[PDB]
Design a protein around this ligand. Structure first.
Ligand SMILES: [Mg+2]
Ligand SMILES: [Mg+2]
Ligand SMILES: [Mg+2]
Ligand SMILES: [Mg+2]
Ligand SMILES: [Mg+2]
Ligand SMILES: [Mg+2]
Ligand SMILES: [Mg+2]
Ligand SMILES: [Mg+2]
Ligand SMILES: [Mg+2]
Ligand SMILES: [Mg+2]
Ligand SMILES: [Mg+2]
Ligand SMILES: [Mg+2]
Ligand SMILES: [Mg+2]
Ligand SMILES: [Mg+2]
Ligand SMILES: [Mg+2]
Ligand SMILES: [Mg+2]
Ligand SMILES: [Mg+2]
Ligand SMILES: [Mg+2]
Ligand SMILES: [Mg+2]
Ligand SMILES: [Mg+2]
Ligand SMILES: [Mg+2]
Ligand SMILES: [Mg+2]
Ligand SMILES: [Mg+2]
Ligand SMILES: [Mg+2]
Ligand SMILES: [Mg+2]
Ligand SMILES: [Mg+2]
Ligand SMILES: [Mg+2]
Ligand SMILES: [Mg+2]
Ligand SMILES: [Mg+2]
Ligand SMILES: [Mg+2]
Ligand SMILES: [Mg+2]
Ligand SMILES: [Mg+2]
Ligand SMILES: [Mg+2]
Ligand SMILES: [Mg+2]
Ligand SMILES: [Mg+2]
Ligand SMILES: [Mg+2]
Ligand SMILES: [Mg+2]
Lengths: 77, 149
RNA sequence: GCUUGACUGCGAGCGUGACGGCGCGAGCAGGUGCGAAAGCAGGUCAUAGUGAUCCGGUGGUUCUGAAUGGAAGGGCCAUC
RNA sequence: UGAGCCUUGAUGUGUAGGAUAGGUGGGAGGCUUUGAAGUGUGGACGCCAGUCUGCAUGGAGCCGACCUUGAAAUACCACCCUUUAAUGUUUGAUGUUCUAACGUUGACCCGUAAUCCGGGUUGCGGACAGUGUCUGGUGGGUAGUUUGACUGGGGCGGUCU
RNA sequence: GUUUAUUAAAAACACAGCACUGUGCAAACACGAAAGUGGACGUAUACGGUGUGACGCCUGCCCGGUGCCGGAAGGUUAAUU
RNA sequence: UUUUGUAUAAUGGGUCAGCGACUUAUAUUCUGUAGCAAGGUUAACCGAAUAGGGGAGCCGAAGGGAAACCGAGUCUUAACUGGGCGUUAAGUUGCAGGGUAUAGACCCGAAACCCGGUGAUCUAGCCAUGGGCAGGUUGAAGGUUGGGUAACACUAACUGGAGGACCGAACCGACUAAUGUUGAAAAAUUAGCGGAUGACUUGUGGCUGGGGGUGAAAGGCCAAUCAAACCGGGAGAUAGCU
RNA sequence: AGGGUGACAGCCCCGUACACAAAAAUGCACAUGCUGUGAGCUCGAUGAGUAGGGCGGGACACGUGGUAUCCUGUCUGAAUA
RNA sequence: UAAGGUGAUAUGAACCGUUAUAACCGGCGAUUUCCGAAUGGGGAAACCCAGUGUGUUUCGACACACUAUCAUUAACUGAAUCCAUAGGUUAAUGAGGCGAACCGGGGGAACUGAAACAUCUAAGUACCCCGAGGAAAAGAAAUCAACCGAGAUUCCCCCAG
C-alpha cells in the first residue's frame, strides 16, 4: 500500500474544486519512492518504501536512528 | 546539508569540514560508501571531542619529548674513546650503534634509531656536533669529543 | 439680456396603487437667479425615455472599530 | 555561462597645477637582493593625454609639503566613495561527459528441483525516463442538469416592460 | 452463414475482399487506483482501430468550413518567480 | 367523486364482517380560562422529591436612532413654524384550544436516484474435456496412361476422393397457414418449411457481474424481468397530481 | 403486594411484611504472601523537519471573505527563557 | 430439599424411592462423537486420505495422542560470499473466530430542499472497513478572559435561533 515506511503517511482524501465551485472526491498522494540506502551498521543496503519528506527527515535525523525506531515499531527489513 | 566528510573528495573534503551541500552525492552514494557521515547535532560535536581529545593529548606530548632533547642539551659534551692512530686517524669507527650505549649510560637513555648524523661516521677524532630526530622539529645540538686512548 | 431654482433641507394636504412603489403640492428655512418692484424660478406644455434586492467600486463622515490605540471591515451620505 | 559575492587592488585629465591630486581620518618619508628604478613587451583605463598590471630583462636604488593648490601627492599606513575586475564560491541559462540514485519485461549465483520474488553478480540505459504535488490545453469517455410562459389543443409564427 | 428466446429472418448483421490509420515490442490497444494480465510465448507477410463489402469496369472536381497531420520563426499565453 | 354542469352512456364500490386516514413533540402567536400583578416566572438541578429549595435566565414596566448617543422623548436638519416614530390604554406564567414553524406532519400511490449485497443451473461470448451427423448424389487437386511437344504446354482416358458442394432422417433451426388465444402449453400443436462434414450440433465443468458484463448488432441476452437485472437497505425518497 | 382455588377469599393454598440460612464457586471492597512495578531526594532536563511560510484540499456555526484559528498531500523552514 | 420420582406430546411398560445414594433445586468437577475459526492435509460443511509415537501373552490394519498459519523470544542448523546475513527445524507463549447496542477511527452516497438547478441543502447522514472497552472517547491550557479575573476534561440549563 502507498504507506511511507518511514512516517506512516498515506493517501488522503479531499476535493477537486472547480471554478463554478463544484466539489469532487479525490486523492492526494505522496511522491513516495522505493529508494535504497547504505548501512555500515548492518553491512547490507536494504531498500524501503519512503515519502517525499520520507527522506528529508532521515537526512536531518540519523539514517540509523530510524531502523531502530522501526525495530521497536515491530517490522522486518 | 551539513554531512561531514572523511577523505579528500574533489575540491575539498579537508578531512573534517562541515558543509552546505546537496542531498545527492550524499545519502544517494557518497555517504553510502564510507566517505562522510550524517552531520547530526550529535556527530557535529562527536568529532569535536576528537579534535579536542587527540589535540591537547598526543599532540603536546611532543613536549614530553622536546625537553629530552634539552635533557641532552644540559650535557653539551660526552666523550667516547676507542683507539686512534697518531695524528687522529682512529682505526675502526665511531658507530651509530656505539653512540647508543655511550649515552645510554650518560643519562638520556636512547636506542639506535634516533641518532641522526652527517656522514657515515666515524673515523676522524676531536669535535663533532649532532642533530637528532627525537620527534619532528626542534632537533638537539649534541657534541661528542672522541678521545684516543 | 442677464443669468444656473435642472438649487440643499423640509413639507399641511392630496392623488394612485394588493404591495414594493409612483405622482401633484402651497407653504418653512438656508441660500440664489432675474424684476425697480407685485412677483416668478426646486428643470423642459402635460403625460413614454426604464431595472427591485443582492454583491462589489469611488468619495464623504470616528457613527462602528472584537484586550487598548490604530487599522481592516461594517454602518450611515452621494454614488457608480 | 548570467547574476549574488566576501577579500583584492584598483580609478577621479575642474581652472592653474611634475597632470586623468578620490573624498577624507592618518601624513615625512615608507618600500627596497622575500634583488629597486631603467628599459622590452603583454594587456588594462583613453577627454590620443596618461594611469593600472603580468612577465622577462635589469641591478643599488625609486617617491615631498614643495613653489603652485579650495584638497597637494598615488610616499606608505587607516576606513571607503564612485568606477570595477579577480580567484573562492553560490546558483540560474545552454551544450559535454560521467555512475552511485532511479529504471532494466538481457546475462548468471543463491535461498531452490520454483519462468514468482528477494538477495548477489554482470550488461544496458541513466539523472533522462518514471511516480508525486502543483499547473495551461484537451477532454460526450463519464457524470449532474438546464433547454421559459402565454397560446381559441401543441407546435410554428407572433407577443412579454 | 447471423439476428430482434416470445408479432420483424430482412434489402438488416457477419463474410472473404479493399482502403485508410495506429503500432519497433516493456508495442499500439484493452481490463485493473495498482500489482499484475490479455495483445502473444505473437513481433510489421505481425497486431489493433475506422469505414467499404465477392468478382467485373471503376471511384471525377472542392481543404473555403469542421476534424485531423505537420512546421516551430513570431504574437498571445498557467503554476512559479 | 369531480364539475359551469351529471339519471348520466363520466369516476369508485360484488356483499358482509373487522382495521384504515388531520397525529405527536417542540417552538411560536391569537382566543378562552385560571393565579399573581408593575410585576410575572422559573430553567436544568438539589430534594425530605408532584411539596420546598434553585430567580441563571426569559417576558414587561421606554422609547427614538443605522450607530455613538439622547430619552418622555428621540430621529430628522445647520435648524424647523416642522415632520416620522414615541409618551398617554398591564403585564406575565400556566391550562384548553384556533393558527403557524420545524419535523414522514392528514392517509394511501409513483417512474426514478443512491449504497451494499445475490446471481452465467436461462441466456450471450469464451475455455477445457468427452460425445453426434441413417441413406443417396455431384466428382475439384493429385496420380497413371495413350496422344502431343525439341522439352513444356495442352490432351484423353482411367484412377483418385476435394467442398462453410447437392438431395435428404436423426440432430439443430423457425419462413407460411390454420388451430389454440379463461390453451394440452405464460410462444405450443399440426400440415408444410431452412441448415444438416460446418462459421455444425450436444453433455459435463470452468470463466466473464450491473453504467458492468456478453453481443456475426436487435437495445439483443444477462433465471418467464432489461434504454441499465435481482435482493436488502437510504425509505415514510419526492409527488404544486389523482 | 400479587397469584391459585368449582362465582368475587386479609384468615383454604402459593406468597406477602418481617426475621433468618451456604458445604461449594464466585464478583466488588479492605488486608496480606510471591513475580514485575518504581517510590525518595537532590541537582537536572523542558520533546525541529518541529513551529511558521508558498501551492491544493479539508476541519472550524464562519461558503476566501477584511478571515485570526486548527488538519496536512506538496514544496519549504525558524527561534531555544 | 424431600416424600415421592423414570422432561414434553404422553399413555402404558419395567422400575427408583418413602428418613436419607429415589427424584428435584444449587456450587464444582467428570465425560463431552462428527462438522464448524477447524488448526496434519484435501473438500461439494458434519466427509476422503495421512505422517511421527504407542498399544497387544493378537504387536498386520484398525485403535489412540501430537502435527495449520503467522507475530514474539530462544536454541539449533545455515546461502549466493570470508565474517556474517537471508534461509531453514524445533521449542515456549500469544493471536485467529463468534457477538445486541452504544464508542474512536479509514472510506462515505443519492434521493431530497432551494418550489428548476450547478454553490449551498440533505450530511459527515445512510451504508461499507478497521479497532476497543465497560463504557469508549476526550483531559491536566502553548485555554479563556479584557487590564477585573477565570483555571483539565465529559455532561445538563441558559446566553439564543
Ligand atoms: Mg482587534
Ligand atoms: Mg468605509
Ligand atoms: Mg450526459
Ligand atoms: Mg439534483
Ligand atoms: Mg407550456
Ligand atoms: Mg423473433
Ligand atoms: Mg428470457
Ligand atoms: Mg489489421
Ligand atoms: Mg457494410
Ligand atoms: Mg451495403
Ligand atoms: Mg488537396
Ligand atoms: Mg495542430
Ligand atoms: Mg369535466
Ligand atoms: Mg364547485
Ligand atoms: Mg340534470
Ligand atoms: Mg353508474
Ligand atoms: Mg378521471
Ligand atoms: Mg366500476
Ligand atoms: Mg428577581
Ligand atoms: Mg453452461
Ligand atoms: Mg453440404
Ligand atoms: Mg435440405
Ligand atoms: Mg420468429
Ligand atoms: Mg377450416
Ligand atoms: Mg412442425
Ligand atoms: Mg438505473
Ligand atoms: Mg409518501
Ligand atoms: Mg361460572
Ligand atoms: Mg513539554
Ligand atoms: Mg494553506
Ligand atoms: Mg481436520
Ligand atoms: Mg481441513
Ligand atoms: Mg488429495
Ligand atoms: Mg429540489
Ligand atoms: Mg434522506
Ligand atoms: Mg480512557
Ligand atoms: Mg492573572
Amino acid at each position: 500500500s502507498r504507506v511511507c515506511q518511514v512516517t506512516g503517511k498515506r493517501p488522503v482524501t479531499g476535493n477537486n474544486r472547480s471554478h463554478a465551485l463544484n466539489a469532487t472526491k479525490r486523492r492526494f498522494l505522496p511522491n513516495l519512492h522505493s529508494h535504497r540506502f547504505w548501512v555500515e551498521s548492518e553491512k547490507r543496503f536494504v531498500t524501503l518504501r519512503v515519502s517525499a519528506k520520507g527522506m528529508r527527515v532521515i537526512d536531518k535525523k540519523g539514517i540509523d536512528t530510524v531502523l531502530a525506531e522501526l525495530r521497536a515499531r515491530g517490522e522486518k527489513y | 546539508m551539513q554531512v561531514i566528510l572523511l577523505d579528500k573528495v574533489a575540491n575539498l573534503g579537508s578531512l573534517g569540514d562541515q558543509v552546505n551541500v546537496k542531498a545527492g552525492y550524499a545519502r544517494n552514494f557518497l555517504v553510502p560508501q564510507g566517505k562522510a557521515v550524517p552531520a547530526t547535532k550529535k556527530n557535529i560535536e562527536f568529532f569535536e571531542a576528537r579534535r579536542a581529545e587527540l589535540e591537547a593529548k598526543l599532540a603536546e606530548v611532543l613536549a614530553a619529548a622536546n625537553a629530552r632533547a634539552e635533557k641532552i642539551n644540559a650535557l653539551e659534551t660526552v666523550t667516547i674513546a676507542s683507539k686512534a692512530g697518531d695524528e687522529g686517524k682512529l682505526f675502526g669507527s665511531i658507530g651509530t650503534r656505539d653512540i647508543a650505549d655511550a649515552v645510554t649510560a650518560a643519562g638520556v637513555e636512547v636506542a639506535k634509531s634516533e641518532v641522526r648524523l652527517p656522514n657515515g661516521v666515524l673515523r676522524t677524532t676531536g669535535e663533532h656536533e649532532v642533530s637528532f630526530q627525537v620527534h619532528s622539529e626542534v632537533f638537539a645540538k649534541v657534541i661528542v669529543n672522541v678521545v684516543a686512548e
